[PDB]
Amino acid sequence: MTIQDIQSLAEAHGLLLTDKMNFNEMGIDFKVVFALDTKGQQWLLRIPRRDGMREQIKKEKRILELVKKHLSVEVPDWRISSTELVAYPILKDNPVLNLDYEIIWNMDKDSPKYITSLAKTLFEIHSIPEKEVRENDLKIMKPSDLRPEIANNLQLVKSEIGISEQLETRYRKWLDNDVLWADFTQFIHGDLYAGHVLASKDGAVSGVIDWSTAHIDDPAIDFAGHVTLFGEESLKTLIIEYEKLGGKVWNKLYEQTLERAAASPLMYGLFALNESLIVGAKAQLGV
Ligand SMILES: CC[C@H]1OC(=O)[C@H](C)[C@@H](O[C@H]2C[C@@](C)(OC)[C@@H](O)[C@H](C)O2)[C@H](C)[C@@H](O[C@@H]2O[C@H](C)C[C@H](N(C)C)[C@H]2O)[C@](C)(O)C[C@@H](C)CN(C)[C@H](C)[C@@H](O)[C@]1(C)O
Ligand SMILES: Nc1nc2c(ncn2[C@@H]2O[C@H](CO)[C@@H](O)[C@H]2O)c(=O)[nH]1
C-alpha cells in the first residue's frame, strides 16, 4: 500500500496524517504502519488485509478495554477501530526484539529487570477474573477441555500437513502425562513473546502490544514464548520470581511449559489453516 492510500484511509476516519511513515509486515493478518499526524503525534496503524474481520476487531477492542484495568503496563489505546482501520498512539517503548526470520534484539538479552518486570506482568494478566472473561464473550478453555482439543489438533495436523513420527510420539506422551497438565486454567495473553513485549533498554517492561489471542487457557502457554528465546535457566528464574510475587504455579509448570514450547510447530500448523508459504514453513518445522 502506498503512503497516499494510507493517508486517504486515515482521513476517511478523521485522522490527518503526514507522508512520513514506516512499515511493518512481520505481522500476520494486518498491515502495520508507523505514521505521524499533522499535530506531531506518532500513531500505530493496523490495516486489515481482508474484508470481514469485524468480529475479531471488536473482540480485541473488548480485550484491550478489559485488560486495561488490571495491568500496570501500557496496552494499545485504540482511538480508531473500524472494520477498515485500527489506530492507536504509539506506546512508550520499543519491542524487546524485532524479527525480519532473524532476531534483532533491542535490549540486552540477559537484562535482569526483564525477568522481574515480565514476572510482574504475567502475574497481573493471570489474575484477571473469569467472570469478566466470560462476560466479554471470550473463549474459555478449562483443563478438562485442554487435552482432547490438543488431540483434535494432532489429528487435523498429521493428515492435512504431515507430522514427524518423533513429533507425534512426543505430543502423545505430553497428552499422556496427567502430572504435566494444571488443575487450573487462567486468563492468558495467548501470543506472548519478546516481540510483543515493550521495554526500555535496561529491560523494564513498559507495555504488551497484541491482545487478539487472549482467552482463558493453560498458564504455561504464556511462559513458553519466553523459554524459546531466553533458554531454560532464564525460564526457571522467571518461574521463581513469578511464584515469589504470588503467582499460581504447580509442581510441573516448568516441564509443561517445555512441552508447550515443543508443541510450537503443531499449533503453528493448526493456525495456518490459509497461506501456502506458512504451510510450507510449518511442513518444514514439522517433518
Ligand atoms: C525466537 C525466535 C523464533 O520465534 C518463535 O519461535 C516464537 C516463540 C513463536 O511462538 C511460539 C510460542 C507461542 C506461545 O507464541 C508466542 C506459541 O503460540 C507458538 C505457536 O510458538 C512464534 C511467534 C510463532 O508465531 C506464532 O504462531 C502462532 C501459531 C500464531 C501467532 N500469532 C500470529 C497469533 C504467531 O505469533 C511461529 C509459529 O514460530 C511463527 C512462524 C510463522 C515463524 N517461525 C518459525 C519463526 C522463524 C520463529 O521460529 C522465530 C521468529 O525464529
Ligand atoms: N514501537 C512500537 N512498535 C509497535 C507498536 N505496536 C506494534 N508495533 C510493532 O508492530 C508489530 C505488529 O503489531 C509488532 O510486532 C511490533 O514490532 C507500538 O506501540 N510501538
Side-chain angles (χ1 to χ4, degrees), residues 27-29 97 99 101-103 105 190-194 196 212-213 220-226 228-229 260-261 263-272 278 281-282 284-285:
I28 308 301
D29 255 326
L97 59 84
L99 308 170
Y101 209 154
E102 279 168 343
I103 319 89
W105 289 89
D191 190 18
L192 185 56
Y193 80 108
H196 292 168
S212 73
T213 88
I221 295 144
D222 253 47
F223 276 87
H226 184 78
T228 317
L229 276 142
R260 281 293 190 175
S264 214
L266 164 80
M267 311 231 81
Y268 187 6
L270 67 83
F271 161 89
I278 268 52
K282 155 158 199 333
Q284 187 254 21
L285 206 75

Side-chain angles (χ1 to χ4, degrees), residues 24 26 32 34 44 88 90-91 93-95 98 195-196 209-210:
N24 182 321
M26 98 162 68
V32 173
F34 307 86
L44 199 294
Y88 51 100
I90 191 98
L91 295 192
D93 290 299
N94 288 319
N98 289 119
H196 292 168
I209 58 153
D210 291 288

Side-chain angles (χ1 to χ4, degrees), residues 190-231:
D191 190 18
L192 185 56
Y193 80 108
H196 292 168
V197 174
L198 308 194
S200 54
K201 273 259 293 183
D202 289 345
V205 172
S206 42
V208 177
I209 58 153
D210 291 288
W211 287 92
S212 73
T213 88
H215 63 306
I216 286 162
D217 213 277
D218 154 65
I221 295 144
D222 253 47
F223 276 87
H226 184 78
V227 81
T228 317
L229 276 142
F230 295 89

